[PDB]
Design a protein around this ligand. Structure first.
Ligand SMILES: [Ca+2]
Ligand SMILES: [Zn+2]
Ligand SMILES: [Zn+2]
Ligand SMILES: [Zn+2]
Ligand SMILES: [Zn+2]
Lengths: 156, 161
Protein backbone atom coordinates (compact mmCIF):
# COMPACT_ATOMS: atom_id res chain seq x y z
CA UNK A 1 0.00 0.00 0.00
CA UNK A 2 2.72 2.45 0.99
CA UNK A 3 1.90 5.30 3.33
CA UNK A 4 -1.83 4.63 3.58
CA UNK A 5 -2.79 1.79 5.92
CA UNK A 6 -4.12 -1.49 4.57
CA UNK A 7 -7.82 -2.17 5.04
CA UNK A 8 -6.80 -5.15 7.17
CA UNK A 9 -4.22 -3.45 9.40
CA UNK A 10 -6.47 -2.91 12.42
CA UNK A 11 -7.77 -6.48 12.12
CA UNK A 12 -4.21 -7.76 12.00
CA UNK A 13 -2.93 -5.80 14.99
CA UNK A 14 -5.99 -6.66 17.07
CA UNK A 15 -5.38 -10.36 16.39
CA UNK A 16 -1.68 -10.00 17.21
CA UNK A 17 -2.64 -8.32 20.48
CA UNK A 18 -5.16 -11.07 21.29
CA UNK A 19 -2.41 -13.65 20.78
CA UNK A 20 -0.06 -11.71 23.06
CA UNK A 21 -2.75 -11.60 25.76
CA UNK A 22 -3.33 -15.35 25.44
CA UNK A 23 0.39 -16.00 25.73
CA UNK A 24 0.53 -13.82 28.83
CA UNK A 25 -2.37 -15.75 30.36
CA UNK A 26 -0.51 -19.00 29.68
CA UNK A 27 2.44 -17.68 31.66
CA UNK A 28 4.54 -17.02 28.58
CA UNK A 29 6.16 -14.05 26.85
CA UNK A 30 3.38 -11.67 25.69
CA UNK A 31 4.35 -11.36 22.03
CA UNK A 32 1.81 -12.30 19.39
CA UNK A 33 1.15 -11.97 15.70
CA UNK A 34 -0.60 -13.16 12.58
CA UNK A 35 -0.14 -13.39 8.82
CA UNK A 36 -2.88 -11.94 6.62
CA UNK A 37 -3.45 -12.24 2.88
CA UNK A 38 -3.54 -8.67 1.54
CA UNK A 39 -5.89 -9.83 -1.23
CA UNK A 40 -8.94 -10.77 0.84
CA UNK A 41 -7.89 -10.26 4.45
CA UNK A 42 -7.88 -13.99 5.17
CA UNK A 43 -5.88 -15.03 8.22
CA UNK A 44 -3.28 -17.58 7.10
CA UNK A 45 -2.11 -18.14 10.66
CA UNK A 46 -1.80 -16.64 14.12
CA UNK A 47 0.36 -17.37 17.13
CA UNK A 48 2.42 -16.22 20.08
CA UNK A 49 5.74 -16.91 21.80
CA UNK A 50 6.00 -20.54 22.94
CA UNK A 51 9.28 -20.45 24.86
CA UNK A 52 7.67 -21.34 28.18
CA UNK A 53 4.72 -23.34 26.87
CA UNK A 54 6.86 -25.65 24.71
CA UNK A 55 10.37 -25.10 26.09
CA UNK A 56 11.23 -23.56 22.72
CA UNK A 57 14.30 -21.46 21.94
CA UNK A 58 13.09 -20.56 18.44
CA UNK A 59 9.33 -20.08 18.65
CA UNK A 60 9.23 -16.30 19.02
CA UNK A 61 5.81 -14.79 18.37
CA UNK A 62 6.62 -14.19 14.70
CA UNK A 63 8.17 -17.63 14.15
CA UNK A 64 5.24 -19.32 15.88
CA UNK A 65 2.87 -17.36 13.65
CA UNK A 66 4.62 -18.59 10.51
CA UNK A 67 4.78 -22.15 11.86
CA UNK A 68 1.02 -22.09 12.43
CA UNK A 69 0.41 -21.16 8.78
CA UNK A 70 1.79 -24.53 7.76
CA UNK A 71 3.69 -25.36 4.58
CA UNK A 72 2.82 -22.87 1.85
CA UNK A 73 3.99 -22.38 -1.73
CA UNK A 74 6.48 -19.53 -1.83
CA UNK A 75 4.20 -17.28 -3.88
CA UNK A 76 1.58 -17.05 -1.12
CA UNK A 77 3.90 -15.08 1.19
CA UNK A 78 4.58 -12.50 -1.51
CA UNK A 79 1.27 -10.72 -0.92
CA UNK A 80 0.79 -10.93 2.84
CA UNK A 81 1.42 -8.75 5.86
CA UNK A 82 2.93 -10.09 9.05
CA UNK A 83 1.61 -8.42 12.18
CA UNK A 84 3.67 -8.46 15.36
CA UNK A 85 3.01 -6.78 18.70
CA UNK A 86 6.73 -5.99 19.10
CA UNK A 87 9.48 -4.92 16.68
CA UNK A 88 11.22 -8.08 15.32
CA UNK A 89 14.61 -9.36 16.48
CA UNK A 90 17.22 -10.25 13.87
CA UNK A 91 15.86 -13.80 13.55
CA UNK A 92 12.22 -12.88 13.00
CA UNK A 93 13.38 -10.10 10.68
CA UNK A 94 15.31 -12.77 8.78
CA UNK A 95 12.22 -14.95 8.49
CA UNK A 96 10.22 -12.09 6.99
CA UNK A 97 13.05 -11.43 4.55
CA UNK A 98 13.57 -15.07 3.55
CA UNK A 99 9.89 -15.63 2.73
CA UNK A 100 9.56 -12.28 1.00
CA UNK A 101 6.65 -11.08 3.15
CA UNK A 102 6.34 -7.50 1.77
CA UNK A 103 4.86 -5.75 4.81
CA UNK A 104 5.51 -5.89 8.54
CA UNK A 105 3.15 -4.01 10.85
CA UNK A 106 4.56 -3.54 14.35
CA UNK A 107 2.69 -2.76 17.55
CA UNK A 108 5.55 -0.93 19.26
CA UNK A 109 9.34 -0.58 19.30
CA UNK A 110 9.71 1.11 22.68
CA UNK A 111 10.26 -1.94 24.89
CA UNK A 112 12.46 -3.54 22.23
CA UNK A 113 14.00 -2.78 18.83
CA UNK A 114 16.84 -4.53 17.01
CA UNK A 115 18.78 -3.58 13.90
CA UNK A 116 16.22 -5.72 12.11
CA UNK A 117 13.58 -2.99 11.93
CA UNK A 118 15.84 -0.90 9.69
CA UNK A 119 17.32 -3.94 7.92
CA UNK A 120 13.80 -4.81 6.75
CA UNK A 121 13.66 -1.40 5.06
CA UNK A 122 17.14 -1.85 3.61
CA UNK A 123 15.94 -5.14 2.12
CA UNK A 124 12.93 -3.50 0.47
CA UNK A 125 10.11 -4.28 2.90
CA UNK A 126 7.52 -1.80 4.13
CA UNK A 127 7.65 -1.29 7.88
CA UNK A 128 4.81 0.28 9.84
CA UNK A 129 5.06 1.08 13.56
CA UNK A 130 1.67 1.72 15.17
CA UNK A 131 2.86 2.57 18.70
CA UNK A 132 -0.10 0.63 20.13
CA UNK A 133 -0.21 1.46 23.85
CA UNK A 134 -2.11 -1.74 24.67
CA UNK A 135 0.82 -3.80 23.40
CA UNK A 136 3.39 -1.54 25.03
CA UNK A 137 1.73 -1.68 28.46
CA UNK A 138 1.36 -5.47 28.33
CA UNK A 139 4.98 -6.07 27.32
CA UNK A 140 6.23 -3.54 29.88
CA UNK A 141 4.32 -5.33 32.63
CA UNK A 142 6.01 -8.62 31.73
CA UNK A 143 9.44 -6.98 31.62
CA UNK A 144 8.78 -5.36 35.00
CA UNK A 145 7.82 -8.61 36.74
CA UNK A 146 10.01 -11.13 34.89
CA UNK A 147 13.02 -9.22 33.46
CA UNK A 148 15.20 -12.34 33.32
CA UNK A 149 12.62 -14.30 31.34
CA UNK A 150 12.45 -11.44 28.85
CA UNK A 151 16.24 -11.36 28.59
CA UNK A 152 16.28 -15.10 27.89
CA UNK A 153 13.92 -14.66 24.94
CA UNK A 154 16.46 -12.38 23.27
CA UNK A 155 19.60 -14.17 24.45
CA UNK A 156 20.40 -11.48 27.03
CA UNK B 1 29.22 -6.40 2.25
CA UNK B 2 32.71 -4.88 2.35
CA UNK B 3 35.69 -5.57 0.10
CA UNK B 4 38.28 -6.28 2.80
CA UNK B 5 36.39 -9.40 3.89
CA UNK B 6 38.28 -12.36 5.34
CA UNK B 7 37.30 -15.86 6.42
CA UNK B 8 38.19 -17.22 9.84
CA UNK B 9 40.65 -19.33 11.82
CA UNK B 10 40.24 -23.08 12.33
CA UNK B 11 38.93 -24.55 15.58
CA UNK B 12 39.93 -27.87 17.13
CA UNK B 13 36.26 -28.88 17.24
CA UNK B 14 35.43 -27.99 13.63
CA UNK B 15 36.07 -31.50 12.31
CA UNK B 16 33.74 -32.94 14.95
CA UNK B 17 31.10 -30.28 14.38
CA UNK B 18 30.88 -30.75 10.62
CA UNK B 19 30.87 -34.54 10.94
CA UNK B 20 27.83 -34.30 13.21
CA UNK B 21 26.17 -31.77 10.89
CA UNK B 22 26.70 -34.13 7.94
CA UNK B 23 25.35 -37.05 9.97
CA UNK B 24 22.23 -35.01 10.69
CA UNK B 25 21.86 -34.23 6.98
CA UNK B 26 22.11 -37.92 6.06
CA UNK B 27 19.51 -38.73 8.70
CA UNK B 28 17.17 -36.14 7.23
CA UNK B 29 17.72 -37.51 3.73
CA UNK B 30 16.91 -40.99 5.04
CA UNK B 31 13.66 -39.64 6.48
CA UNK B 32 12.72 -38.19 3.09
CA UNK B 33 13.39 -34.60 4.09
CA UNK B 34 15.72 -31.77 3.09
CA UNK B 35 19.33 -32.93 3.74
CA UNK B 36 20.54 -29.96 5.75
CA UNK B 37 21.93 -30.58 9.21
CA UNK B 38 23.87 -28.92 11.98
CA UNK B 39 24.89 -28.85 15.61
CA UNK B 40 25.88 -26.32 18.25
CA UNK B 41 29.13 -26.86 20.13
CA UNK B 42 30.39 -25.06 23.23
CA UNK B 43 33.82 -23.64 22.40
CA UNK B 44 34.67 -23.76 26.11
CA UNK B 45 34.80 -27.58 26.27
CA UNK B 46 33.73 -29.06 22.94
CA UNK B 47 30.41 -30.24 24.36
CA UNK B 48 27.57 -30.70 21.88
CA UNK B 49 24.66 -28.59 23.13
CA UNK B 50 22.39 -29.90 20.40
CA UNK B 51 22.07 -31.24 16.88
CA UNK B 52 19.34 -31.34 14.27
CA UNK B 53 18.23 -31.26 10.66
CA UNK B 54 15.51 -29.69 8.51
CA UNK B 55 12.03 -30.86 9.57
CA UNK B 56 9.85 -29.26 6.88
CA UNK B 57 8.61 -32.59 5.54
CA UNK B 58 8.87 -34.54 8.80
CA UNK B 59 6.77 -32.10 10.86
CA UNK B 60 5.12 -29.99 8.16
CA UNK B 61 7.25 -27.11 9.45
CA UNK B 62 7.74 -23.80 7.67
CA UNK B 63 10.40 -22.61 10.11
CA UNK B 64 12.43 -25.67 11.09
CA UNK B 65 15.36 -25.25 8.72
CA UNK B 66 18.41 -27.28 9.74
CA UNK B 67 19.89 -24.41 11.75
CA UNK B 68 16.62 -23.55 13.47
CA UNK B 69 15.98 -27.21 14.30
CA UNK B 70 19.48 -27.44 15.76
CA UNK B 71 18.87 -24.48 18.06
CA UNK B 72 15.46 -25.85 19.03
CA UNK B 73 17.04 -29.17 19.99
CA UNK B 74 19.42 -27.44 22.41
CA UNK B 75 16.40 -26.42 24.47
CA UNK B 76 16.03 -23.24 26.51
CA UNK B 77 19.43 -21.81 27.49
CA UNK B 78 20.78 -18.88 29.48
CA UNK B 79 21.72 -16.17 26.98
CA UNK B 80 25.39 -16.28 27.97
CA UNK B 81 25.76 -19.89 26.81
CA UNK B 82 25.38 -19.05 23.11
CA UNK B 83 28.09 -16.38 23.37
CA UNK B 84 30.91 -18.92 23.24
CA UNK B 85 29.63 -21.52 20.82
CA UNK B 86 30.02 -22.39 17.16
CA UNK B 87 27.03 -23.24 15.01
CA UNK B 88 27.85 -25.84 12.37
CA UNK B 89 25.66 -26.13 9.28
CA UNK B 90 26.10 -28.22 6.15
CA UNK B 91 24.87 -25.37 3.93
CA UNK B 92 25.36 -21.58 3.97
CA UNK B 93 22.45 -20.02 5.98
CA UNK B 94 19.45 -18.22 4.52
CA UNK B 95 18.44 -14.82 5.88
CA UNK B 96 16.36 -16.41 8.66
CA UNK B 97 19.01 -18.78 10.00
CA UNK B 98 21.55 -15.98 9.67
CA UNK B 99 19.19 -13.89 11.78
CA UNK B 100 19.04 -16.60 14.45
CA UNK B 101 22.84 -16.69 14.74
CA UNK B 102 22.91 -12.90 15.02
CA UNK B 103 20.09 -12.66 17.58
CA UNK B 104 21.62 -15.21 19.97
CA UNK B 105 25.09 -13.81 19.42
CA UNK B 106 26.65 -17.11 18.37
CA UNK B 107 30.17 -15.78 17.58
CA UNK B 108 31.15 -18.38 15.00
CA UNK B 109 29.49 -20.17 12.09
CA UNK B 110 31.20 -23.01 10.24
CA UNK B 111 29.58 -23.80 6.89
CA UNK B 112 29.86 -27.04 4.94
CA UNK B 113 29.53 -25.40 1.53
CA UNK B 114 28.03 -22.45 -0.33
CA UNK B 115 28.12 -23.89 -3.85
CA UNK B 116 24.55 -25.21 -3.97
CA UNK B 117 23.13 -22.23 -2.10
CA UNK B 118 24.23 -18.89 -0.70
CA UNK B 119 22.11 -16.00 0.54
CA UNK B 120 23.02 -12.46 1.52
CA UNK B 121 23.27 -13.90 5.01
CA UNK B 122 26.81 -15.23 4.68
CA UNK B 123 28.15 -11.71 4.13
CA UNK B 124 25.70 -10.08 6.54
CA UNK B 125 27.03 -12.35 9.29
CA UNK B 126 30.49 -10.86 8.76
CA UNK B 127 29.05 -7.35 8.49
CA UNK B 128 27.49 -7.93 11.91
CA UNK B 129 30.84 -9.12 13.24
CA UNK B 130 30.43 -12.90 13.24
CA UNK B 131 33.30 -15.20 12.27
CA UNK B 132 32.42 -17.23 9.17
CA UNK B 133 34.28 -20.29 7.90
CA UNK B 134 33.37 -22.19 4.73
CA UNK B 135 35.08 -25.59 4.64
CA UNK B 136 33.83 -26.72 1.21
CA UNK B 137 32.97 -30.21 2.49
CA UNK B 138 32.60 -32.50 -0.54
CA UNK B 139 30.32 -34.89 1.35
CA UNK B 140 27.81 -32.11 2.01
CA UNK B 141 28.06 -30.71 -1.51
CA UNK B 142 27.41 -34.08 -3.16
CA UNK B 143 24.43 -34.80 -0.93
CA UNK B 144 22.77 -31.42 -1.43
CA UNK B 145 23.49 -31.43 -5.16
CA UNK B 146 21.69 -34.75 -5.53
CA UNK B 147 18.68 -33.56 -3.53
CA UNK B 148 18.33 -30.36 -5.53
CA UNK B 149 18.65 -32.42 -8.70
CA UNK B 150 15.96 -34.92 -7.70
CA UNK B 151 13.59 -32.55 -5.87
CA UNK B 152 13.89 -29.00 -7.32
CA UNK B 153 10.36 -27.93 -6.32
CA UNK B 154 10.89 -29.12 -2.74
CA UNK B 155 14.16 -27.23 -2.47
CA UNK B 156 12.42 -24.06 -3.67
CA UNK B 157 9.69 -24.42 -1.05
CA UNK B 158 12.28 -24.55 1.73
CA UNK B 159 13.54 -21.12 0.65
CA UNK B 160 10.10 -19.72 -0.14
CA UNK B 161 10.30 -19.73 -3.93
CA1 LIG C 1 16.23 -33.71 -11.81
ZN1 LIG D 1 10.60 -10.76 19.09
ZN1 LIG E 1 12.29 -12.74 17.16
ZN1 LIG F 1 19.20 -23.18 5.05
ZN1 LIG G 1 17.54 -21.07 6.86
Amino acid sequence: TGGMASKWDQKGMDIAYEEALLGYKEGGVPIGGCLINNKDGSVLGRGHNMRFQKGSATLHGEISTLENCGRLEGKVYKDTTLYTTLSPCDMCTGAIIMYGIPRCVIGENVNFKSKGEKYLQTRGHEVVVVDDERCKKLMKQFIDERPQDWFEDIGE
